[PDB]
Design a protein around this ligand. Structure first.
Ligand SMILES: [Zn+2]
Lengths: 61, 82, 132, 213, 135, 101
RNA sequence: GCGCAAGACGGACCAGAGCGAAAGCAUUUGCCAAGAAUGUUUUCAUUAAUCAAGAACGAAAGUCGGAGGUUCGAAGACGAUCAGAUACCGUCGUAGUUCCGACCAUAAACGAUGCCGACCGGCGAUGCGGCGGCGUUAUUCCCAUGACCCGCCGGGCAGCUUCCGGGAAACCAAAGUCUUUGGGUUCCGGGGGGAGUAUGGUUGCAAAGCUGAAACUUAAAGGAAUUGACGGAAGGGCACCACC
């Protein structure tokens, strides 16, 4: 299912041309799951991300 | 270094060295004087002795040989010759 | 970025070192005294010397700094260095020697010393670090 | 077009009475179709269940292959077959700067169950040893192996498979090996790493009844 | 259809996740090892020989295999992860932890974790030459 | 001219050292010329260390590990960036890198 | 998942550790005959060092004969990459890879470093043997032995270090003790090519091995080190005359 999220701390900006920010992502269900994700676009700390598959992992492309 | 005294080495400096590398070759062995407790005899035994030294009277062992030094058996006391 | 070159920092260091009594924390009265002490070709350098001085005067309250040397600290360090205690740290009535130290003193015929209290020597010969 | 899992029926694999947990799980087999019988289908089934599933407070890094041989109508009675250490404890044991002492015997129980007692031991770096490694010379690791094949032949030949697996639950063999062989070179972490099963006499029905009680 | 037991007790099957780089396998089997149930590989999901071992290809390989045994009532699994070993690589494939996480997030439970890959005492000759894979 | 003093090898005082393969390239490099590496990592990657523990029917179940020993060749170690080229004076310093964090 | 067999190979433990004349040598156990080092107030008393001729062993590959063929696999056949591939890559696959009887006698057979001998700096480790010593473990306590701990002696494979001295330097405790040149002794080089070729002899089943020119042709070939430049080598860094 779809899962709504939050941003704890932005880690670093990865990608082929530096287009992807890599971000440490908390959930909004009071969950202690601090997943790391690949977000494309401008991000600061304290965003509200919206994922479709909430079990994916951060790689470096 | 560079001013030792080779004519007069210290007595601990003499005993550290090899027995052929001393100023004069001194042997590292001796003749002990083993006393078996069960008997009353005196049998002069080399320290670094090879195959076993039996008493003539009680005909038991005194020292079985080892790598370097022949180990005495139990109760066998010895007083070193001079 | 905003890094101050050797001209601003060299001039600021000499003008602290010579005129520390007039300089304080306000950048504005620092600028009004840095244009009366020094002859600076004008303002955009004058306000950069006076700003590093205003950042450098706050750095002197928190202790010395590794460049300049000013004589309000260097009298306090001088009175800190001429400091003797009342009874020295070498006047101990019970000083601790090993067994073997007492033997060296007996070689030096100091076995009649009364203050020496020989300690029990260490039972294990364990001092090397565990290699591997 | 047909689900093959409608013709499958379940069975309870029942461990022998040497432990605290008696029923260990389930199994699947199809029904008998006249020509073949499901007991033959469930005959050659081994069960490599660990020890923490059979006893509660013990260690978990030991295994036990269990062949089943009796079916009792939703009751599958199994027999001890073999033993093994897990492959994480094995690779955890093997460090670099010590010796490994291996041994094995083809020892015989009193009922005729020809086992094979493998073994493994390692030397122990001391508490105050500044020295980097602790190897052992060749007559030392031949004398440890001599005292290993002594004890894992004198702890098996006096008994049958009743008492051998009672010894194998707290692993008294290794706790006697290290306690006997401190006086040669201190062994560190010594076990029996495998027990195979070479040949078995013909099955008697009432004997396995005694093994389940 | 299933084990006639109360649901507080947890029944056990064993899965043998044969993780490689050609593809990843998920082969659930009963505790005997003899009568197996279903073998949902990683290659059955995507139709691409390049993507036959991707970490998403084992995310979907261990989602459908958690529906056939949940159809038969199995609630807790035993895990025997296996790299291809022998003479080839004894490091697990990348589609192994993903196939574990898809099995542990689909409601199923775990039992024991154990690494049975075929390692030899010593084996025969390696596939390549003396000078190796010149590439 | 002689770049290494031990000839890039650990053979010091024997004639022949046995040949083993490479793990990636499968190249017969001798035993004291293979770059060696011992890895101690968990068998399940650390992202799935929470979700393996919630599905545990056992309490405080320990996590088994992978223990493989890797003998890389010389050619494909520098390709894989596990070993690198150093300076002429850093070449003489054979201490292991600071892995302890 | 249970078995059966077939031949191959002996991990991790495996080290800059051990032994061997060098090639070379790791599962258990026994048998057989050798050896180094150490210890010795044993013995013989110069019996020694290096070596033409002559001789033993000699990785891998290969050739005559049998035995076996698990993997791997020269040659060969296919499929792909490619402008082109008769190669790299992938799938099969004869001789071979394994065992024994003969031959072959060569390698980046290397420490690219002849053997014997003396003198010349340190340091910490290590392996084997011997000697001395606090104090901890086990054989129930004692002795003795093992395991450690602290040294010393002898011989080993090595390491770090240094304005010992050498060297063209790189570097070497030997590659030092060298114009302040002489301890003994074998082999062997004389600018680059032609050429380890031609011929002759000899060895071999052959493959080949040993021994081995000249005519002519050239003014350089070459060794270490420096500074750039270049890299489809790495690490880092930057630019909308780069990208996103
Ligand atoms: Zn390689």
């Amino acid at each position: 299912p779809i899962k709504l999220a939050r941003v704890t701390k932005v880690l670093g900006r990865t990608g082929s041309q530096g287009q992807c920010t890599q971000v440490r992502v908390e959930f909004m269900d009071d969950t202690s799951r601090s997943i790391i994700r690949n977000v494309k676009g401008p991000v600061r700390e304290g965003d509200v991300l919206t994922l479709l598959e909430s079990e994916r992992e951060a790689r470096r492309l | 270094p560079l001013a030792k005294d080779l004519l007069h080495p210290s007595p601990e400096e003499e005993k550290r060295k090899h027995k052929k590398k001393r100023l004069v070759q001194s042997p590292n062995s001796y003749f002990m004087d083993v006393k078996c407790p069960g008997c009353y005899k005196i049998t002069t035994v080399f320290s670094h002795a090879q195959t076993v030294v039996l008493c003539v009277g009680c005909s038991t062992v005194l020292c079985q040989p080892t790598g370097g030094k022949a180990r005495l058996t139990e109760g066998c006391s010895f007083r070193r010759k001079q | 970025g905003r890094v101050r070159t050797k001209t601003v920092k060299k001039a600021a260091r000499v003008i602290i070192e010579k005129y520390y009594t007039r300089l304080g924390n306000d950048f504005h009265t620092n600028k009004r005294v840095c244009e009366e002490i020094a002859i600076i070709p004008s303002k955009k350098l004058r306000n950069k010397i006076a700003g590093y001085v205003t950042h450098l005067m706050k750095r002197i309250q928190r202790g010395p700094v590794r460049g300049i040397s000013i004589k309000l600290q260097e009298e306090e360090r001088e009175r800190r260095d001429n400091y003797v205690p009342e009874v020295s740290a070498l006047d101990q009535e019970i000083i601790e020697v090993d067994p073997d130290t007492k033997e060296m003193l007996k070689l030096l015929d100091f076995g009649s010393l009364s203050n020496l209290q020989v300690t029990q020597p260490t039972v294990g010969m364990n001092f090397k670090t565990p290699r591997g | 077009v047909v689900d093959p899992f409608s013709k499958k029926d379940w069975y309870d694999v029942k461990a022998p009475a040497m432990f605290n947990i008696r029923n260990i799980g389930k199994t699947l087999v199809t029904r008998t179709q006249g020509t073949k019988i499901a007991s033959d289908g469930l005959k050659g089934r081994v069960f490599e269940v660990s020890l923490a599933d059979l006893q509660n407070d013990e260690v978990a890094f030991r295994k036990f292959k269990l062949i089943t041989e009796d079916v009792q109508g939703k009751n599958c009675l199994t027999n001890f077959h073999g033993m093994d250490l897990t492959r994480d404890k094995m690779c955890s044991m093997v460090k670099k700067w010590q010796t490994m002492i291996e041994a094995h015997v083809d020892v015989k129980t009193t009922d005729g169950y020809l086992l094979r007692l493998f073994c493994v031991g390692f030397t122990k770096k001391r508490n105050n040893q500044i020295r980097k490694t602790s190897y052992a010379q060749h007559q030392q690791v031949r004398q440890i192996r001599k005292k290993m094949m002594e004890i894992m032949t004198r702890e098996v030949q006096t008994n049958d498979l009743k008492e051998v697996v009672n010894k194998l639950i707290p692993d008294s063999i290794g706790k006697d090996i290290e306690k006997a062989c401190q006086s040669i070179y201190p062994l560190h972490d010594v076990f029996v790493r495998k027990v195979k099963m070479l040949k078995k006499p013909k099955f008697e029905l009432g004997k396995l009844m005694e093994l389940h009680g | 259809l299933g084990p006639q037991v109360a649901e507080g007790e947890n029944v056990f099957g064993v899965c043998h996740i044969f993780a490689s780089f050609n593809d990843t396998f998920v082969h659930v089997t009963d505790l005997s090892g003899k009568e197996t149930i279903c073998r949902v590989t990683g290659g059955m999901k995507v139709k691409a020989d390049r993507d036959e071992s991707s970490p998403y290809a084992a995310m979907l390989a261990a989602q459908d295999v958690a529906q056939r045994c949940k159809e038969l009532g199995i609630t807790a699994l035993h895990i025997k992860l296996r790299a291809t070993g022998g003479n080839r690589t004894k490091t697990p494939g990348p589609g192994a932890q993903s196939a574990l996480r898809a099995l542990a997030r689909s409601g199923m439970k775990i039992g024991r974790i154990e690494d049975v890959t075929p390692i030899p005492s010593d084996s025969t000759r390696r596939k390549g030459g003396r000078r190796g894979r010149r590439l | 001219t002689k770049k290494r003093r031990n000839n890039g090898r650990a053979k010091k005082g024997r004639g022949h050292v046995q040949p083993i393969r490479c793990t990636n390239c499968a190249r017969c490099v001798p035993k004291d010329k293979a770059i060696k590496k011992f890895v101690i990592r968990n068998i399940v990657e650390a992202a799935a260390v929470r979700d393996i523990s919630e599905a545990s029917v056992f309490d405080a179940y320990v996590l088994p590990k992978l223990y493989v020993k890797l003998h890389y060749c010389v050619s494909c170690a520098i390709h894989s960036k596990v070993v690198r080229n150093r300076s002429r004076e850093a070449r003489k310093d054979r201490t292991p890198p600071p892995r302890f964090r």
